[PDB]
Design a protein around this ligand. Structure first.
Ligand SMILES: NS(=O)(=O)c1ccc(O)c(NC(=O)NCCc2ccccn2)c1
Ligand SMILES: [Zn+2]
Length: 257
């Protein structure tokens, strides 16, 4: 099964998922100088006031905080998007060291981690149908750098001991994802893919310019999770990031100058 180890990591994924060598794969390096400012890009609309988190799950490749997406409770609109996209889950990718961990890079710079808030286009009715469409998902990507703590992340950090191993889930209600957002919603955007198998080319990527800062203790607790299931040999869940993929025939647009 695919993973991030020596024999099943990202360079192996194309054998099971040939779209890995596709024309709109993610993540990518964001060359800030080559990104073009687009004045027709609208500001992003993040409407998270009514979000209903339900639980948190270790799926063996990251942990997902899952939301009730059966109504327009937490939605993303505006920006490059047409229509309304509902938040279904968020998760992170992170490194074994503070110097790596993000999937997107900015002028080749790697951040300590990257948060992905995953949304699906309501015109397709549910997530499973949306991922089959070229405009099915909008993923809001937010970089994490190590510095001061992010208070809004602590409730996530504190529950991770209850989902250490693959397959464990925990009730995780009343979590407000607004506590994970930076001050500015300036963004880059490009058409891309899921960054884990099945690598489907269904994502409008919206990557925020401004990182959030989290503490060293906060990211250290991510690194205590396990890829393995309980009662299997312990392999720390670290470096669960795919490296940058060829931009090919794509242009990254910026909402700011
Ligand atoms: N890392 S990412 O590009 O934000 C992202 C977002 C939503 C996703 O469903 C995935 N991929 C993922 O979760 N793979 C395991 C479950 C899955 C997801 C989609 C279709 C089939 N199976 C990646
Ligand atoms: Zn992701």
């Amino acid at each position: 099964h695919w993973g991030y180890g020596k024999h099943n990591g990202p360079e192996h994924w194309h054998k099971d998922f040939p779209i890995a060598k596709g024309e709109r794969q993610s993540p990518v390096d964001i060359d800030t100088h080559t990104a073009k400012y687009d004045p027709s890009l609208k500001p992003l609309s993040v409407s998270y006031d009514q979000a209903t988190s339900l639980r948190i799950l270790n799926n063996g490749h990251a942990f997902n905080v899952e939301f009730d997406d059966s109504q327009d409770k937490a939605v993303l609109k505006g920006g490059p998007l047409d229509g309304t996209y509902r938040l279904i889950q968020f998760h992170f990718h992170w490194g074994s060291l503070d110097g790596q961990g993000s999937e997107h890079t900015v002028d080749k710079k790697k951040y300590a981690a990257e948060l992905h808030l995953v949304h699906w286009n309501t015109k397709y009715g549910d997530f499973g149908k949306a991922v089959q469409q070229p405009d099915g998902l909008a993923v809001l990507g937010i970089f994490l750098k190590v510095g001061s703590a992010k208070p809004g992340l602590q409730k996530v950090v504190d529950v991770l001991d209850s989902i250490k191993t693959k397959g464990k889930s925990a009730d995780f209600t009343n979590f407000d994802p607004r506590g994970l957002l930076p001050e500015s919603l300036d963004y880059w955007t490009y058409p891309g893919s899921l960054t884990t198998p099945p690598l489907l080319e269904c994502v409008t990527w919206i990557v925020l310019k401004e990182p959030i800062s989290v503490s060293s203790e906060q990211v250290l607790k991510f690194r205590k999770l396990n890829f393995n299931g309980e009662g299997e040999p312990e392999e720390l869940m670290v470096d669960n990031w795919r490296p940058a993929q060829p931009l090919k025939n794509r242009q990254i647009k910026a909402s700011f100058k």
